[PDB]
Design a protein around this motif. Structure first.
Motif, PDB file in Angstrom:
ATOM      1  N   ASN A  18     -45.636  15.811  78.553  1.00  0.00           N
ATOM      2  CA  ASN A  18     -45.548  14.160  77.837  1.00  0.00           C
ATOM      3  C   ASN A  18     -46.777  14.154  77.219  1.00  0.00           C
ATOM      4  O   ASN A  18     -46.696  14.328  75.803  1.00  0.00           O
ATOM      5  CB  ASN A  18     -45.046  12.663  78.041  1.00  0.00           C
ATOM      6  N   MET A  19     -47.502  14.117  77.622  1.00  0.00           N
ATOM      7  CA  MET A  19     -49.587  14.507  77.201  1.00  0.00           C
ATOM      8  C   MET A  19     -49.501  15.212  76.350  1.00  0.00           C
ATOM      9  O   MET A  19     -50.304  15.159  74.959  1.00  0.00           O
ATOM     10  CB  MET A  19     -50.599  14.531  77.821  1.00  0.00           C
ATOM     11  N   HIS A  79     -56.840  12.101  74.174  1.00  0.00           N
ATOM     12  CA  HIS A  79     -55.849  12.754  74.617  1.00  0.00           C
ATOM     13  C   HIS A  79     -55.981  13.572  74.903  1.00  0.00           C
ATOM     14  O   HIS A  79     -55.869  13.995  76.568  1.00  0.00           O
ATOM     15  CB  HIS A  79     -54.805  12.967  73.522  1.00  0.00           C
ATOM     16  N   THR A 121     -45.797  13.526  82.833  1.00  0.00           N
ATOM     17  CA  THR A 121     -46.585  13.242  82.532  1.00  0.00           C
ATOM     18  C   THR A 121     -48.041  13.650  81.602  1.00  0.00           C
ATOM     19  O   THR A 121     -48.314  13.450  80.081  1.00  0.00           O
ATOM     20  CB  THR A 121     -47.650  11.638  82.476  1.00  0.00           C
ATOM     21  N   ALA A 122     -48.232  15.061  82.042  1.00  0.00           N
ATOM     22  CA  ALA A 122     -49.121  16.150  81.634  1.00  0.00           C
ATOM     23  C   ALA A 122     -48.172  16.283  80.920  1.00  0.00           C
ATOM     24  O   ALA A 122     -49.211  16.969  79.841  1.00  0.00           O
ATOM     25  CB  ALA A 122     -49.514  17.026  82.806  1.00  0.00           C
ATOM     26  N   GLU A 151     -58.097  13.254  78.821  1.00  0.00           N
ATOM     27  CA  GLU A 151     -58.031  12.729  79.903  1.00  0.00           C
ATOM     28  C   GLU A 151     -56.528  14.507  80.242  1.00  0.00           C
ATOM     29  O   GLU A 151     -56.510  14.913  81.233  1.00  0.00           O
ATOM     30  CB  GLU A 151     -56.476  11.837  79.193  1.00  0.00           C
ATOM     31  N   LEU A 152     -56.385  14.697  79.295  1.00  0.00           N
ATOM     32  CA  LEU A 152     -55.278  16.194  79.684  1.00  0.00           C
ATOM     33  C   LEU A 152     -56.136  17.331  80.511  1.00  0.00           C
ATOM     34  O   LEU A 152     -56.176  17.519  81.874  1.00  0.00           O
ATOM     35  CB  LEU A 152     -54.453  16.370  78.379  1.00  0.00           C
ATOM     36  N   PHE A 191     -47.192  15.106  72.605  1.00  0.00           N
ATOM     37  CA  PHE A 191     -48.114  13.739  71.895  1.00  0.00           C
ATOM     38  C   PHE A 191     -48.789  14.851  71.323  1.00  0.00           C
ATOM     39  O   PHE A 191     -49.446  14.977  70.084  1.00  0.00           O
ATOM     40  CB  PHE A 191     -48.764  13.032  72.587  1.00  0.00           C
TER      41      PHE A 191
END
Lengths: 51, 47, 47, 51
Positions: free
Chosen positions: C6-7, B35, C3-4, B38-39, C10
């Motif tokens: 939300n990432m 993750h 989503t960045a 990806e980020l 997480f």
């Protein structure tokens, strides 16, 4: 590149690089754990043979 | 003398539990890594 | 772009889970140590 | 000291000493984990400030 954008980048890069370090450090712990297990097993079987 | 043997068996089983818990830590670590990666990429793309 | 964020949230929560799991590993380790020490002493006593 | 007695002793001593090593190695992992958490938190708050 705004201030917040750069920070997010620094933070993500550092985390990416530090997780590889953590994984490698886990490999070292697993090696100790397996050696501990083999010694514990010899310890147990030595005790069984005694008693 | 019966308890030294019960102790040795207990230490042996705890090292098995250790191993299992380390594998679960390693799963969490590789997920975190994936993750993070990806980020990072999608940040390096946008900025 | 939603989503960045939300990432990132997480990844932050996974590091909290990591910490908790390490503490549980450390509990297991000190217990193993304490039993190893007791067994050692009582062996060094008997032999 | 019989053979099995000595082995049990070696094994218990090694395990006693190796568990201290493992504990110390855990202290190092905790330091990395906390630094990872602080970077993840700054990462999140930077992302919040962006979006």
């Amino acid at each position: 590149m705004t201030k917040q954008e750069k920070t997010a980048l620094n933070m993500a890069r550092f985390i990416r690089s530090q997780t590889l370090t953590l994984l490698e450090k886990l490999n070292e712990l697993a090696d100790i754990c397996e050696s501990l297990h083999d010694h514990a097993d010899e310890l147990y079987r030595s005790c069984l043979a005694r008693f």
